[PDB]
Amino acid sequence: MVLSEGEWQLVLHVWAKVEADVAGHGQDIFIRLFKSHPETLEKFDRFKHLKTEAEMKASEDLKKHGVTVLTALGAILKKKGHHEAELKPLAQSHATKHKIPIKYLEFISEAIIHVLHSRHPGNFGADAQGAMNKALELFRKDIAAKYKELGYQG
Numbered sequence: 001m002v003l004s005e006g007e008w009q010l011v012l013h014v015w016a017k018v019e020a021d022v023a024g025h026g027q028d029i030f031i032r033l034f035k036s037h038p039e040t041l042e043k044f045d046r047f048k049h050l051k052t053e054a055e056m057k058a059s060e061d062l063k064k065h066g067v068t069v070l071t072a073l074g075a076i077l078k079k080k081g082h083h084e085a086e087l088k089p090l091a092q093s094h095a096t097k098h099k100i101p102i103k104y105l106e107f108i109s110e111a112i113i114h115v116l117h118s119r120h121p122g123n124f125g126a127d128a129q130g131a132m133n134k135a136l137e138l139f140r141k142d143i144a145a146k147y148k149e150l151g152y153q154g
Protein backbone atom coordinates (compact mmCIF):
# COMPACT_ATOMS: atom_id res chain seq x y z
CA MET A 1 0.00 0.00 0.00
CA VAL A 2 0.92 3.57 -0.35
CA LEU A 3 -0.56 6.50 1.39
CA SER A 4 -0.89 9.76 -0.42
CA GLU A 5 0.68 12.95 1.01
CA GLY A 6 -2.77 14.26 2.11
CA GLU A 7 -3.37 11.07 4.05
CA TRP A 8 0.05 11.37 5.76
CA GLN A 9 -0.89 14.96 6.53
CA LEU A 10 -4.05 13.85 8.35
CA VAL A 11 -2.08 11.29 10.32
CA LEU A 12 0.74 13.62 11.38
CA HIS A 13 -1.76 16.42 12.14
CA VAL A 14 -3.49 14.36 14.86
CA TRP A 15 -0.19 12.79 15.96
CA ALA A 16 1.10 16.27 16.78
CA LYS A 17 -1.82 16.53 19.23
CA VAL A 18 -1.00 13.24 20.89
CA GLU A 19 2.64 14.45 21.25
CA ALA A 20 1.49 17.27 23.49
CA ASP A 21 0.98 14.57 26.18
CA VAL A 22 2.73 11.34 25.22
CA ALA A 23 2.63 9.66 28.62
CA GLY A 24 -1.09 10.29 29.13
CA HIS A 25 -1.96 8.95 25.70
CA GLY A 26 0.34 5.84 26.27
CA GLN A 27 -1.51 5.15 29.48
CA ASP A 28 -5.00 5.47 28.04
CA ILE A 29 -4.08 3.24 25.09
CA PHE A 30 -2.53 0.36 27.14
CA ILE A 31 -5.34 0.49 29.63
CA ARG A 32 -7.91 0.25 26.77
CA LEU A 33 -5.98 -2.64 25.26
CA PHE A 34 -5.66 -4.60 28.57
CA LYS A 35 -9.24 -4.09 29.50
CA SER A 36 -10.50 -4.95 26.10
CA HIS A 37 -8.22 -7.91 25.42
CA PRO A 38 -6.93 -9.06 28.75
CA GLU A 39 -4.98 -11.90 27.23
CA THR A 40 -2.58 -9.27 26.00
CA LEU A 41 -1.57 -8.46 29.57
CA GLU A 42 -0.07 -11.93 29.84
CA LYS A 43 2.68 -11.03 27.45
CA PHE A 44 4.15 -8.56 29.99
CA ASP A 45 6.08 -10.27 32.78
CA ARG A 46 6.48 -6.84 34.28
CA PHE A 47 2.69 -6.09 34.37
CA LYS A 48 0.84 -9.38 34.44
CA HIS A 49 0.00 -9.12 38.10
CA LEU A 50 -1.97 -5.85 37.69
CA LYS A 51 -5.56 -6.55 38.67
CA THR A 52 -7.53 -3.35 38.13
CA GLU A 53 -7.53 -0.17 36.02
CA ALA A 54 -6.72 1.71 39.17
CA GLU A 55 -3.55 -0.38 39.61
CA MET A 56 -2.76 0.17 35.96
CA LYS A 57 -3.14 3.93 36.24
CA ALA A 58 -0.91 3.98 39.22
CA SER A 59 1.86 1.96 37.65
CA GLU A 60 4.85 4.06 36.78
CA ASP A 61 6.51 1.23 34.87
CA LEU A 62 3.45 0.90 32.62
CA LYS A 63 3.45 4.66 32.01
CA LYS A 64 7.12 4.52 31.03
CA HIS A 65 6.45 1.64 28.67
CA GLY A 66 3.62 3.59 27.05
CA VAL A 67 6.00 6.42 26.32
CA THR A 68 8.58 4.05 24.89
CA VAL A 69 5.94 2.50 22.57
CA LEU A 70 4.39 5.73 21.37
CA THR A 71 7.74 7.37 20.76
CA ALA A 72 8.85 4.41 18.59
CA LEU A 73 5.44 4.50 16.70
CA GLY A 74 5.69 8.25 16.24
CA ALA A 75 9.17 7.89 14.70
CA ILE A 76 7.84 5.37 12.22
CA LEU A 77 4.84 7.45 11.25
CA LYS A 78 7.00 10.52 10.60
CA LYS A 79 9.00 8.44 8.04
CA LYS A 80 5.84 8.47 5.86
CA GLY A 81 6.29 4.91 4.66
CA HIS A 82 10.13 4.88 4.42
CA HIS A 83 10.51 3.06 7.66
CA GLU A 84 12.53 0.03 6.79
CA ALA A 85 15.40 0.69 9.17
CA GLU A 86 13.11 1.51 12.06
CA LEU A 87 11.11 -1.66 11.62
CA LYS A 88 14.09 -4.07 11.57
CA PRO A 89 15.03 -4.04 15.27
CA LEU A 90 11.44 -3.77 16.24
CA ALA A 91 10.41 -6.80 14.19
CA GLN A 92 13.31 -8.81 15.56
CA SER A 93 12.56 -8.25 19.23
CA HIS A 94 8.83 -8.71 18.92
CA ALA A 95 9.14 -11.86 16.84
CA THR A 96 11.93 -13.61 18.78
CA LYS A 97 11.95 -12.20 22.30
CA HIS A 98 8.45 -10.92 23.13
CA LYS A 99 6.52 -13.12 20.59
CA ILE A 100 3.77 -10.70 19.71
CA PRO A 101 1.30 -12.09 17.19
CA ILE A 102 0.06 -9.81 14.42
CA LYS A 103 -3.35 -10.26 15.98
CA TYR A 104 -2.18 -8.33 19.07
CA LEU A 105 -0.80 -5.53 16.89
CA GLU A 106 -4.32 -5.40 15.37
CA PHE A 107 -5.73 -5.09 18.96
CA ILE A 108 -3.51 -2.13 19.93
CA SER A 109 -4.22 -0.47 16.57
CA GLU A 110 -7.91 -0.54 17.59
CA ALA A 111 -6.99 0.83 21.03
CA ILE A 112 -5.10 3.64 19.38
CA ILE A 113 -7.92 4.53 17.14
CA HIS A 114 -10.41 4.43 20.06
CA VAL A 115 -8.36 6.80 22.21
CA LEU A 116 -7.69 9.24 19.35
CA HIS A 117 -11.35 9.28 18.61
CA SER A 118 -12.24 9.99 22.22
CA ARG A 119 -9.61 12.64 22.84
CA HIS A 120 -9.36 14.39 19.48
CA PRO A 121 -12.88 14.31 17.83
CA GLY A 122 -12.22 17.51 15.98
CA ASN A 123 -9.01 16.32 14.37
CA PHE A 124 -10.09 12.72 13.98
CA GLY A 125 -13.16 12.72 11.73
CA ALA A 126 -13.83 9.92 9.24
CA ASP A 127 -11.21 10.83 6.73
CA ALA A 128 -8.51 11.33 9.39
CA GLN A 129 -9.50 7.94 10.98
CA GLY A 130 -9.32 6.27 7.57
CA ALA A 131 -5.85 7.66 7.01
CA MET A 132 -4.66 6.55 10.46
CA ASN A 133 -6.12 3.10 9.89
CA LYS A 134 -4.31 2.92 6.55
CA ALA A 135 -1.00 3.98 8.21
CA LEU A 136 -1.36 1.30 10.89
CA GLU A 137 -2.34 -1.36 8.40
CA LEU A 138 0.82 -0.46 6.39
CA PHE A 139 2.84 -0.78 9.58
CA ARG A 140 1.31 -4.19 10.38
CA LYS A 141 1.78 -5.46 6.84
CA ASP A 142 5.46 -4.49 6.76
CA ILE A 143 6.11 -5.94 10.20
CA ALA A 144 4.24 -9.19 9.24
CA ALA A 145 6.53 -9.44 6.19
CA LYS A 146 9.56 -9.00 8.38
CA TYR A 147 8.26 -11.61 10.88
CA LYS A 148 8.18 -13.99 7.95
CA GLU A 149 11.77 -13.32 6.90
CA LEU A 150 12.78 -13.80 10.54
CA GLY A 151 10.99 -17.10 10.85
CA TYR A 152 8.05 -16.19 13.03
CA GLN A 153 5.09 -15.12 10.91
CA GLY A 154 2.63 -15.08 13.74
Ligand code: HEM
Pocket residue numbers: 040041043044045046065068069070072073089090093094098100104105108
Ligand atom coordinates in the same frame (compact mmCIF):
# COMPACT_ATOMS: atom_id res chain seq x y z
C1 HEM B 1 2.24 0.15 17.84
C2 HEM B 1 2.90 -1.07 18.26
C3 HEM B 1 4.08 -1.39 19.04
C4 HEM B 1 5.20 -0.71 19.00
C5 HEM B 1 5.56 0.54 18.08
C6 HEM B 1 6.02 -1.35 20.08
C7 HEM B 1 7.35 -0.80 20.59
C8 HEM B 1 8.12 -1.38 21.61
C9 HEM B 1 9.42 -0.91 21.88
C10 HEM B 1 10.14 0.22 21.16
C11 HEM B 1 9.83 -1.67 23.02
C12 HEM B 1 11.26 -1.57 23.72
C13 HEM B 1 12.28 -2.10 22.72
C14 HEM B 1 12.13 -3.56 22.29
O1 HEM B 1 11.85 -4.43 23.12
O2 HEM B 1 12.03 -3.78 21.09
C15 HEM B 1 8.75 -2.61 23.27
C16 HEM B 1 8.85 -3.65 24.18
C17 HEM B 1 7.80 -4.55 24.37
N1 HEM B 1 6.62 -4.66 23.66
FE1 HEM B 1 6.11 -3.69 22.00
N2 HEM B 1 5.38 -2.34 20.68
C18 HEM B 1 4.18 -2.32 20.08
C19 HEM B 1 3.13 -3.28 20.37
C20 HEM B 1 3.26 -4.30 21.33
C21 HEM B 1 2.14 -5.08 21.66
C22 HEM B 1 0.73 -4.98 21.01
C23 HEM B 1 2.51 -5.92 22.69
C24 HEM B 1 1.80 -6.93 23.52
C25 HEM B 1 0.49 -7.48 23.71
C26 HEM B 1 3.90 -5.58 23.00
C27 HEM B 1 4.67 -6.24 24.01
C28 HEM B 1 5.95 -5.69 24.37
C29 HEM B 1 6.69 -6.28 25.42
C30 HEM B 1 6.36 -7.53 26.28
C31 HEM B 1 7.85 -5.52 25.45
C32 HEM B 1 8.91 -5.52 26.48
C33 HEM B 1 8.51 -4.70 27.71
C34 HEM B 1 9.53 -4.79 28.87
O3 HEM B 1 9.32 -5.61 29.77
O4 HEM B 1 10.17 -3.77 29.09
N3 HEM B 1 4.36 -4.57 22.10
N4 HEM B 1 7.75 -2.48 22.42
